[PDB]
Amino acid sequence: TLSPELIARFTAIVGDKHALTDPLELEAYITEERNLYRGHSPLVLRPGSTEEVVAICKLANEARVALVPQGGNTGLVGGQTPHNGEVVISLKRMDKIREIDTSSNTITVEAGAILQRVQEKAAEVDRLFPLSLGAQGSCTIGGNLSTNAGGTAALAYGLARDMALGVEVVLADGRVMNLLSKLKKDNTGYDLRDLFIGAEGTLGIITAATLKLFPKPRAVETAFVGLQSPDDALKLLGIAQGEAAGNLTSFELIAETPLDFSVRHANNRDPLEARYPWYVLIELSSPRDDARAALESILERGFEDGIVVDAAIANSVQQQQAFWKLREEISPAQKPEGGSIKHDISVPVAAVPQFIEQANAAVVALIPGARPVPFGHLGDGNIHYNVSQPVGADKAEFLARWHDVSQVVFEVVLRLGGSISAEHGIGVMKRDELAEVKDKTAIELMRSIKALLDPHGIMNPGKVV
Amino acid sequence: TLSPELIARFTAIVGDKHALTDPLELEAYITEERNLYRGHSPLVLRPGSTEEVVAICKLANEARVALVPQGGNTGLVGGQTPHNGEVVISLKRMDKIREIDTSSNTITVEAGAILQRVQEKAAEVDRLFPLSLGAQGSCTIGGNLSTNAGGTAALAYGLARDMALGVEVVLADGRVMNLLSKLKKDNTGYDLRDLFIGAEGTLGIITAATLKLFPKPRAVETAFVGLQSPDDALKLLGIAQGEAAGNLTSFELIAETPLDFSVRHANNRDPLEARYPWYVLIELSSPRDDARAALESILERGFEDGIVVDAAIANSVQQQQAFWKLREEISPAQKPEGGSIKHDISVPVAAVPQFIEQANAAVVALIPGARPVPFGHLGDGNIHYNVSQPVGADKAEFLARWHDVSQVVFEVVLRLGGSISAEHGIGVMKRDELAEVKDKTAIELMRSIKALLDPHGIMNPGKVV
Numbered sequence: 001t002l003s004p005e006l007i008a009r010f011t012a013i014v015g016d017k018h019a020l021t022d023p024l025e026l027e028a029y030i031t032e033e034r035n036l037y038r039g040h041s042p043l044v045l046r047p048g049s050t051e052e053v054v055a056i057c058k059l060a061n062e063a064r065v066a067l068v069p070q071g072g073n074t075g076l077v078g079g080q081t082p083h084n085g086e087v088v089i090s091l092k093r094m095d096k097i098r099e100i101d102t103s104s105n106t107i108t109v110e111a112g113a114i115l116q117r118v119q120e121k122a123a124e125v126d127r128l129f130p131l132s133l134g135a136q137g138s139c140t141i142g143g144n145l146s147t148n149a150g151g152t153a154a155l156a157y158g159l160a161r162d163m164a165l166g167v168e169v170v171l172a173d174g175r176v177m178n179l180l181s182k183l184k185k186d187n188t189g190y191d192l193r194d195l196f197i198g199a200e201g202t203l204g205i206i207t208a209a210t211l212k213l214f215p216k217p218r219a220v221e222t223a224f225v226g227l228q229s230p231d232d233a234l235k236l237l238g239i240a241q242g243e244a245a246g247n248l249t250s251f252e253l254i255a256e257t258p259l260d261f262s263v264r265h266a267n268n269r270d271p272l273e274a275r276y277p278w279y280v281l282i283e284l285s286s287p288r289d290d291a292r293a294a295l296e297s298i299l300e301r302g303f304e305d306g307i308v309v310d311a312a313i314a315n316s317v318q319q320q321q322a323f324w325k326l327r328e329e330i331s332p333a334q335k336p337e338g339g340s341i342k343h344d345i346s347v348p349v350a351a352v353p354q355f356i357e358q359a360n361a362a363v364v365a366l367i368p369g370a371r372p373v374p375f376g377h378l379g380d381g382n383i384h385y386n387v388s389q390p391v392g393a394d395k396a397e398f399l400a401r402w403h404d405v406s407q408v409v410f411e412v413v414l415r416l417g418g419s420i421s422a423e424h425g426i427g428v429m430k431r432d433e434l435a436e437v438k439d440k441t442a443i444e445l446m447r448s449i450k451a452l453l454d455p456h457g458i459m460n461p462g463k464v465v
Numbered sequence: 466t467l468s469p470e471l472i473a474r475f476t477a478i479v480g481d482k483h484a485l486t487d488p489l490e491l492e493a494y495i496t497e498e499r500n501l502y503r504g505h506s507p508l509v510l511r512p513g514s515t516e517e518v519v520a521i522c523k524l525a526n527e528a529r530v531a532l533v534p535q536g537g538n539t540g541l542v543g544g545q546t547p548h549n550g551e552v553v554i555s556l557k558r559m560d561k562i563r564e565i566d567t568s569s570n571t572i573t574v575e576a577g578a579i580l581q582r583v584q585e586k587a588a589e590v591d592r593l594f595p596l597s598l599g600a601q602g603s604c605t606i607g608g609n610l611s612t613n614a615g616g617t618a619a620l621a622y623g624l625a626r627d628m629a630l631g632v633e634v635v636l637a638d639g640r641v642m643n644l645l646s647k648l649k650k651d652n653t654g655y656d657l658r659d660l661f662i663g664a665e666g667t668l669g670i671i672t673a674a675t676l677k678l679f680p681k682p683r684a685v686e687t688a689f690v691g692l693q694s695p696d697d698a699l700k701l702l703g704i705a706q707g708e709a710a711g712n713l714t715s716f717e718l719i720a721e722t723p724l725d726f727s728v729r730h731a732n733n734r735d736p737l738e739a740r741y742p743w744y745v746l747i748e749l750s751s752p753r754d755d756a757r758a759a760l761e762s763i764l765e766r767g768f769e770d771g772i773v774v775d776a777a778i779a780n781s782v783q784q785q786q787a788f789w790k791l792r793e794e795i796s797p798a799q800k801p802e803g804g805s806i807k808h809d810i811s812v813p814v815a816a817v818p819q820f821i822e823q824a825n826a827a828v829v830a831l832i833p834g835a836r837p838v839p840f841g842h843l844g845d846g847n848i849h850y851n852v853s854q855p856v857g858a859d860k861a862e863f864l865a866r867w868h869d870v871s872q873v874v875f876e877v878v879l880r881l882g883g884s885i886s887a888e889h890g891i892g893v894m895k896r897d898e899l900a901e902v903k904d905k906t907a908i909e910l911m912r913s914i915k916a917l918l919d920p921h922g923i924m925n926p927g928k929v930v
């Protein structure tokens with residue numbers, strides 16, 4: 001394990017109050033929210049500056065001590081978990097918002113800033129930080145950038161990658177690469193920024209970043225739509241895109257089952273008079289007061305084309321929140337319904353109906369009575385493809401089929417040109433599957449860059465590659 | 466020079482009709498239209514497939530023959546020019562449009578596809594390819610991605626980088642990295658795509674790419690605005706951004722002098738009743754017919770705030786084209802007015818007024834009577850900062866001060882946090898200056914990545930780093 005000498009020296013760098021070794025305090029860092037993996041660590045460091053992160057890395061690199069960068073600890077692939085006596089480097093104390101430029105429309109923040117607080121400050125100066133996500137209350141900017149987080153609004157605003165203008169990164173050997181910048185155009189050499197975004201802390205530690213700010217929309221309009229098939233929803237998407245372009249900030253495809261779960265278990269209101277096999281939750285966000293006219297125009301063309309069967313446009317803020325509460329509570333609504341085998345994948349937008357149809361048939365053939373629970377962002381091709389246990393089956397016995405379900409789901413994903421990890425990343429969970437599916441040259445380069453940036457293998461080893 | 470043996474072997478790969486060695490034929494590849502540099506080469510190859518590009522690279526790598534990738538040959542920093550007997554690898558024959566997916570909104574094209582033809586193909590299927598430059602008719606996709614080209618509408622659509630979904634690249638050692646993808650979400654390993662975008666052919670040869678398609682706007686409105694200062698133009702931008710958001714497709718800042726040249730030397734109509742020291746050419750694009758109301762609302766806030774002095778909204782297509790012709794012809798209208806020291810830089814949007822003010826003063830201090838000709842994309846901070854000679858001065862004596870003007874211009878850029886190369890890139894011209902201004906660690910990594918991807922130094926050597 002880690003020697004007293006090294007513990008003492010790391011402790012001195014950050015101050016003993018910010019150097020945890022007591023198992024009761026370590027408990028919050030060695031495990032995560034979903035209880036997927038349970039790791040072990042002899043030390044958690046909570047540095048308060050890049051200077052301290054540098055001191056930490058130089059020592060770790062010299063003593064061959066493995067480090068695991070961690071932000072909000074909401075990652076779902078064991079990327080931020082110390083599985084093998086590694087020292088955790090939490091960035092929660094580096095949470096300062098350094099500068100907000102409303103003319104350049106930028107915001108500079110430390111890695112540990114909580115996504116929700118950045119959104120709040122953006123809002124306080126009549127601006128929007130559009131990266132909206134599920135774990136907003138506790139996930140951090142450093143985490144968002146390292147995993148390349150993306151949300152429901154991705155179709156309009158892009159991913160974390162699209163939000164970044166600059167980053168400050170400390171490497172394994174202690175060097176600092178400061179590429180903080182407020183520039184929208186800058187073609188001065190290779191793009192190193194994007195290499196760390198999505199790196200899951202395997203190439204270095206992000207200590208700060210400069211992000212884009214956007215205009216705050218003046219009008220937001222929402223609607224629930226009842227349709228017969230995912231294919232009809234895809235035609236509606238075509239209409240929405242052509243009629244709203246950048247103002248279309250949500251287009252969610254929800255199957256009857258997930259909606260039914262949210263209604264019966266999360267105390268939510270069924271939005272339409274009758275039940276439909278498929279639903280779409282559509283939202284428009286505009287700088288002018290013309291969002292409702294666009295929505296109505298989209299719904300009109302959909303009625304005319306016979307793809308929309310019924311629709312309910314929200315008439316108040318309470319009713320909008322009611323619509324979203326239903327969507328946001330699908331996840332927890334699954335728990336009382338039994339075992340759930342979860343997968344977050346993506347395919348070309350055109351291939352979403354094929355994916356659903358193909359996955360469903362394969363999954364039900366594997367486990368008769370299994371209940372697919374699909375819902376997602378049809379506009380960026382990311383579907384949460386979950387399967388709930390057959391009514392009355394044993395939970396433990398059903399969850400044991402996870403891997404068998406993965407094989408089947410991934411074969412459909414791969415034949416459709418999709419991705420085995422759309423948002424969450426690779427970390428430790430999908431490390432093996434990455435080597436099997438990724439382009440051979442691409443994978444060789446990743447290993448070569450890893451070896452170059454972390455020759456001694458102390459920067460979050462055993463993850464991604 | 467290059468041996469007959471090797472010339473014969475390269476010739477055999479592509480076929481002798483696509484292997485040029487006659488000096489009259491080489492002339493078009495060893496020099497660019499703006500006579501900045503004049504190189505030399507013993508051979509130009511025009512391969513017709515990725516397989517041939519692989520064959521060329523393997524042979525070049527074995528024999529240690531340097532290669533210079535080239536597309537449209539419109540780059541302005543000497544990147545595509547062979548300065549040392551290198552073999553030119555033109556991609557002009559690989560110009561196939563492979564697939565147009567209007568549901569996924571993607572388009573897969575070969576590296577040699579002319580930008581303008583891609584724009585036209587997108588239009589044929591009621592879609593838009595928003596990347597738009599001045600060399601459109603000659604520049605290729607491979608060129609655009611390699612230089613990370615951007616243009617007038619960057620503030621709304623982004624740069625070439627923002628257009629890219631996947632790329633196919635051939636490395637110096639012949640390996641093919643196929644990252645062609647239609648996926649909008651894919652967190653599967655490191656982002657290698659963006660490493661090559663902006664690499665200027667120094668890290669491999671891009672042979673194909675998957676790009677995004679956008680909705681075709683239904684309405685386009687344009688106005689020419691007269692203001693008293695760049696600072697007032699910046700306040701107007703804030704108003705335009707808040708009121709139009711993503712529908713603001715052009716916000717140009719034009720000083721009186723360039724507008725004066727365009728009117729007097731390009732036969733363009735002066736768009737306003739009186740003359741103003743500063744002008745803004747603003748354009749809005751919308752999927753609905755609400756563009757004119759947004760523009761009129763923008764200009765109304767401008768008049769009320771006292772920042773807009775006069776404004777003319779184009780009332781016909783002929784009038785819109787008249788406005789754009791004036792702006793697009795500022796570049797050639799400088800020629801008859803004497804020597805022109807040109808710089809294409811960027812600073813944070815908030816700093817544009819400070820940059821213009823500071824650069825003008827320093828340039829006039831350097832060369833009394835020199836006439837600054839500044840114009841550009843205020844929304845992304847990219848100013849074409851050119852200086853025309855003093856009236857009556859000697860053209861040669863003036864152009865001899867290019868370097869002196871650069872020292873001064875860059876000092877203003879660097880103190881404001883800007884870039885010495887906003888669009889064109891580094892290539893050979895700014896290779897030494899990059900090493901002086903870029904972050905020290907960043908430059909170390911670029912050299913290590915270069916050494917890793919091109920160990921024998923055959924991939925466009927002596928450029929970028």
Ligand SMILES: Cc1cc2nc3c(=O)[nH]c(=O)nc-3n(C[C@H](O)[C@H](O)[C@H](O)COP(=O)(O)OP(=O)(O)OC[C@H]3O[C@@H](n4cnc5c(N)ncnc54)[C@H](O)[C@@H]3O)c2cc1C
Nearest residue numbers: 071072073074075079134140142143146149150200201206
């Ligand atoms: C309820 C819930 C909803 C979620 N919804 C979404 C969603 O909608 N979209 C989505 O993309 N994800 C979602 N996630 C997962 C998402 O990846 C994480 O929530 C988030 O991106 C990680 O942020 P974090 O601060 O928790 O990072 P952590 O969990 O601490 O770390 C995640 C990875 O980033 C690395 N890392 C963290 N900080 C740094 C740093 N500063 N420098 C270098 N590496 C670092 C870690 O080493 C690890 O590899 C959700 C998770 C939960 C529990």
Ligand SMILES: Cc1cc2nc3c(=O)[nH]c(=O)nc-3n(C[C@H](O)[C@H](O)[C@H](O)COP(=O)(O)OP(=O)(O)OC[C@H]3O[C@@H](n4cnc5c(N)ncnc54)[C@H](O)[C@@H]3O)c2cc1C
Nearest residue numbers: 536537538539540544599605607608614615665666671888
């Ligand atoms: C009149 C005029 C207006 C211009 N306006 C703009 C503008 O508004 N915005 C802007 O950004 N630029 C502008 N440019 C310059 C711009 O960079 C080029 O026009 C364009 O991006 C290069 O395309 P190309 O096909 O001609 O590439 P080339 O000039 O042939 O090559 C440029 C660089 O890319 C590399 N390269 C080319 N093809 C490949 C390949 N497939 N694989 C790997 N490397 C490759 C070359 O080695 C070289 O380093 C302008 C140029 C002119 C003459």
